[PDB]
Amino acid sequence: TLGPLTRLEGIKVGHERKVQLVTDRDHFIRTLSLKPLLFEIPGFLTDEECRLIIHLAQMKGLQRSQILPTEEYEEQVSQLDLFRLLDQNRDGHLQLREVLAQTRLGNGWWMTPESIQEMYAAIKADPDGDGVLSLQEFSNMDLRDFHKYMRSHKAESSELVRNSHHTWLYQGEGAHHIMRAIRQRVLRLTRLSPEIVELSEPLQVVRYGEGGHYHAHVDSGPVYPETICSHTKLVANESVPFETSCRYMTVLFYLNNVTGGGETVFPVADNRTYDEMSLIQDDVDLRDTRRHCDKGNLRVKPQQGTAVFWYNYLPDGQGWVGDVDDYSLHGGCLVTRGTKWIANNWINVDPSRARQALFQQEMARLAREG
Amino acid sequence: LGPLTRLEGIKVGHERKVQLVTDRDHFIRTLSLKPLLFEIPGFLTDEECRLIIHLAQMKGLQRSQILPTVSQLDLFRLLDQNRDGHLQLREVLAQTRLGNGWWMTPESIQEMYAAIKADPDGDGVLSLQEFSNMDLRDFHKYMRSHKAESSELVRNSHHTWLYQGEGAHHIMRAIRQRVLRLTRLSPEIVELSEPLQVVRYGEGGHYHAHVDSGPVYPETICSHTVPFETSCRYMTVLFYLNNVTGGGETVFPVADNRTYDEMSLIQDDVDLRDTRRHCDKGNLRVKPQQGTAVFWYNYLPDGQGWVGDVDDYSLHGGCLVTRGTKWIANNWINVDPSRARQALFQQEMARLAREG
Ligand SMILES: *[C@@H]1O[C@H](CO)[C@@H](O[C@@H]2O[C@H](CO)[C@@H](O[C@@H]3O[C@H](CO[C@H]4O[C@H](CO[C@H]5O[C@H](CO)[C@@H](O)[C@H](O)[C@@H]5O[C@H]5O[C@H](CO)[C@@H](O)[C@H](O)[C@@H]5O)[C@@H](O)[C@H](O[C@H]5O[C@H](CO)[C@@H](O)[C@H](O)[C@@H]5O)[C@@H]4O)[C@@H](O)[C@H](O[C@H]4O[C@H](CO)[C@@H](O)[C@H](O)[C@@H]4O[C@H]4O[C@H](CO)[C@@H](O)[C@H](O)[C@@H]4O[C@@H]4O[C@H](CO)[C@@H](O)[C@H](O)[C@@H]4O)[C@@H]3O)[C@H](O)[C@H]2NC(C)=O)[C@H](O)[C@H]1NC(C)=O
Ligand SMILES: *[C@@H]1O[C@H](CO)[C@@H](O[C@@H]2O[C@H](CO)[C@@H](O[C@@H]3O[C@H](CO[C@H]4O[C@H](CO[C@H]5O[C@H](CO)[C@@H](O)[C@H](O)[C@@H]5O[C@H]5O[C@H](CO)[C@@H](O)[C@H](O)[C@@H]5O)[C@@H](O)[C@H](O[C@H]5O[C@H](CO)[C@@H](O)[C@H](O)[C@@H]5O)[C@@H]4O)[C@@H](O)[C@H](O[C@H]4O[C@H](CO)[C@@H](O)[C@H](O)[C@@H]4O[C@H]4O[C@H](CO)[C@@H](O)[C@H](O)[C@@H]4O[C@H]4O[C@H](CO)[C@@H](O)[C@H](O)[C@@H]4O)[C@@H]3O)[C@H](O)[C@H]2NC(C)=O)[C@H](O)[C@H]1NC(C)=O
Ligand SMILES: *[C@@H]1O[C@H](CO)[C@@H](O[C@@H]2O[C@H](CO)[C@@H](O)[C@H](O)[C@H]2NC(C)=O)[C@H](O)[C@H]1NC(C)=O
Ligand SMILES: *[C@@H]1O[C@H](CO)[C@@H](O[C@@H]2O[C@H](CO)[C@@H](O)[C@H](O)[C@H]2NC(C)=O)[C@H](O)[C@H]1NC(C)=O
Ligand SMILES: O=C(O)CNC(=O)C(=O)O
Ligand SMILES: O=C(O)CNC(=O)C(=O)O
Ligand SMILES: [Ca+2]
Ligand SMILES: [Ca+2]
Ligand SMILES: [Ca+2]
Ligand SMILES: [Ca+2]
Ligand SMILES: [Cl-]
Ligand SMILES: [Cl-]
Ligand SMILES: [Fe+2]
Ligand SMILES: [Fe+2]
């Protein structure tokens, strides 16, 4: 028993409220959407603090955000059971949008209509070349040929799901006083318990170079009664079943002005319904943030010092964490000129209140013991 | 040996019939005279483009460019090309070798200035004051620590090589013979030049504008024949292996331009060598068409039938691919600018054929 989780009311799109986060000046929280519940705070960071974060990130050294895949995907399905899973509309034919909807099949590579049809042509999977695999065409191909194509596929990071470099910065005791003042500022903003905030993932600093992108995704995975949160798991490192990120909130800081592109897109923000049938189509995949940013419902233009933040889950009706909010779908749009620097604070809450409770009060046990 | 046959462009748009296979007719169309640039539609069948792609895929492609690992007043006056006591952005951009494999942009230079705080006033210009209040260590370690994407490199693609000599696939050397009849050159020169290069440009790939051969000095050595070793490619023959859904043109930024002037080529706001940003501003673009071959001369004549200086107008690059993939193959014809070296080289190679 920890008490109800604070969830800020969006009230309506465009609602601005004064908030006091620093004694010096006033800040203003603007509601950008309700689905997902998404806010914006101009000037959350000073120009000096942005430049400090970048420099601390550069001094540590960045690494490729996503490893270049070397293989096909692995997870027990017979070939036809895979067909039945892919054929959403059950017409005996795999349309491009149905293949596109299973991006995990790319095993890290981002699939496009062109990349799919180029693979079809290489392994001769589509004899009549219409972009559709009928049941006969699907059953007529040896999946070993598909595997061999994935094993030898050589492509650039612009063909990945995630195309950026990043690192992490500590914010607890023993860190630069500015890095710790920022954590206290996030704590004062989200009005969550100090335990929750100071136990979440360290600050991630991301550099998008000219040409970088991050196709649209959600920050936290589904909630089953057996899913396991990495932040709450006793073992420092594992490759367990059901491991997932349990990020209650995402706080995103724009560390610089971007000369061209680089927006954050929420493709279905405040859309009346959420329908993957129109999200992913043969001609337009709204998750592609290299091609179709301009068609998403809402974009946030990077502005130095601005923080945007949003909840990744719905409420559950009792003050804790509900299902994931499908509308929190978001990506990093293609950077056309210059580099884009951002930082994100993820607030971790286990969807099981009892499991989170055992993680907090024992993380305090070890501070006393150690 | 005999004088190198150099085809006559006549005028832009001039089209002449040529017979390279006995099946059909080909047509050589002049695209420009500076550089001397031709286009032949349907040079390759749709089946041979599919075979070249299929062959390269099996061999496996490698990343085309690997990511990188005197005084200051010697350096300042060497870059201050207009001698105005300032380093304009265009003057830093003019020396891409300083990027050491990274492509420099106005935004990347100004990003680096602010990192090491070289520009207090932030106007983008490095005064002599600002440039000596500098210290080259910091700049060196900025390049030390710089990690960036392949889209920030000069060359952003993957490639491999396919052999065309004896024992190779019968379709392959049939292309080599077709190239020979097209160029009207000595079988010694063609069959002793580099193997065919197959390049894959992924979506988001590019190759910034460059020339295919280094300058001519009495002390340069051709790799096909290490102090100042450079590539001596007399001709470049480029094959388009697929239709490209978006972008991926070959740009010749200064084709048939009245003069060649790097002051207008590289400016503070527009670098015409940048094939990610400014392809639409170049003089001439070739749209990839499956089967089409384009070819051009990288050197000027010398007036005596051999190889002159580099043709600056041959500057060219691969434009950003916006949708899909772009596959091309290119044949490089190597000729030694010193005819004496080229003569001894192919006559000696004749030894190891009849000796073997
Ligand atoms: C592809 O091919 C094209 C064509 O070949 C080529 O373009 C040429 O590029 C050059 C480089 O960019 C251009 O060079 C300019 O020219 C300006 C002057 O501009 C004009 O005059 C041209 C010549 O005019 C005459 O002759 C014609 C016949 O040839 C005739 O028809 C005309 O009527 C005109 O006639 C008169 O003058 C004659 C004497 O010249 C006389 O005999 C006659 O009786 C009559 O009185 C003219 O052709 C131009 O017209 C074109 O261009 C403009 C602008 O592009 C168009 O709008 C227009 O429609 C025309 O198409 C134009 O009218 C020079 O001032 C300039 O020199 C500056 O820059 C160079 C850099 O190269 C420096 O070396 C030089 O020192 C000087 O520097 C200053 O200025 C620059 C910024 O401009 C700064 O960077 C410097 O720091 C310096 O700064 C200054 O600071 C001072 C104070 O501190 C201050 O005092 C200064 O004002 C300034 O602020 C340079 O030479 C050339 O014009 C282009 N030619 C054409 C035809 O376009 C491309 O470059 C090629 N592409 C590539 C990639 O190579
Ligand atoms: C963000 O939010 C958006 C809004 O919520 C959301 O958009 C919604 O998207 C879905 C899915 O993309 C759309 O669903 C489609 O609707 C089509 C019908 O289109 C018309 O009708 C609807 C509903 O209309 C009535 O009701 C309202 C009130 O509710 C009234 O105001 C209207 O006047 C209208 O009135 C009458 O009808 C009522 C009964 O329905 C009566 O009660 C009443 O009295 C009236 O008589 C309208 O809203 C539509 O308007 C929109 O579009 C038109 C232009 O098209 C605009 O002018 C207009 O302004 C609106 O913007 C429209 O008029 C269905 O046909 C369609 O069904 C097919 O596809 C789905 C999946 O996509 C399948 O489940 C389904 O089985 C159908 O399958 C076929 O067709 C596809 C298409 O090719 C095939 O690929 C497929 O294989 C299948 O094939 C078969 O049929 C084909 C022909 O049908 C044939 O060619 C084949 O050969 C094969 O045989 C689908 O249900 C929905 O309309 C959108 N709503 C709106 C408001 O836009 C969006 O998705 C959200 N975004 C994201 C990312 O989630
Ligand atoms: C980044 O861009 C913003 C947007 O223009 C700049 O903000 C402007 O000017 C003052 C200067 O601090 C700010 O208080 C305003 O909020 C901004 N103007 C508007 C209209 O919003 C900001 O200065 C830029 N930062 C850098 C480092 O270039
Ligand atoms: C690649 O594109 C070219 C040009 O769009 C296609 O060529 C045309 O070929 C058809 C016959 O198949 C002619 O009817 C058109 O007139 C041609 N157009 C031009 C501009 O020459 C070519 O078929 C395409 N190849 C592939 C494999 O898609
Ligand atoms: O880079 C952007 O604008 C989008 N950011 C993210 O998806 C993230 O790192 O959580
Ligand atoms: O990609 C293109 O069209 C340009 N190609 C080249 O510059 C080359 O490989 O020599
Ligand atoms: Ca189907
Ligand atoms: Ca088919
Ligand atoms: Ca200068
Ligand atoms: Ca300055
Ligand atoms: Cl509300
Ligand atoms: Cl890469
Ligand atoms: Fe994200
Ligand atoms: Fe080239």
Author numbering:
A (entry chain A): 107 to 181, 187 to 481
B (entry chain B): 108 to 176, 188 to 343, 351 to 481
Text lifted from the article:
In addition to collagen P4Hs and hypoxia-inducible factor P4Hs, a third P4H—the poorly characterized endoplasmic reticulum–localized transmembrane prolyl 4-hydroxylase (P4H-TM)—is found in animals. All known P4Hs belong to the same enzyme superfamily of iron and 2-oxoglutarate–dependent dioxygenases (2OGDDs). The 2OGDD protein family includes single-domain and large multidomain proteins that are highly variable in their substrate specificity, but P4H-TM is the only enzyme in this family that has EF-hand motifs.
The structure of the soluble part of human P4H-TM was solved with X-ray crystallography in the presence of Fe2+, N-oxalylglycine (NOG), and Ca2+. The crystallized construct consists of residues 88 to 502 of P4H-TM and an N-terminal His-tag, whereas it lacks the short cytoplasmic region and the transmembrane helix. The crystal structure shows that the P4H-TM fold is composed of two well-defined domains: the catalytic domain with the DSBH fold and the EF domain. There are two P4H-TM molecules in the asymmetric unit. The two P4H-TM molecules of the asymmetric unit occupy very similar conformations (RMSD 0.42 Å for all Cα-atoms), and only chain A is discussed unless otherwise stated. The P4H-TM structure contains an EF domain with two EF hands between residues 190 and 251. Calcium is coordinated in a pentagonal bipyramid conformation by seven oxygen ligands from residues listed in Table 1. The active site iron is coordinated by His328, Asp330, His441, and the oxygen atoms from C-1 carboxylate and C-2 carbonyl of NOG. NOG is coordinated at the C-5 carboxyl group by Tyr319, Thr375, and Lys451 and at the C-1 carboxyl by Asn455. In this P4H-TM structure, the α1-α2 loop is partially disordered and positioned like a lid in an open conformation.
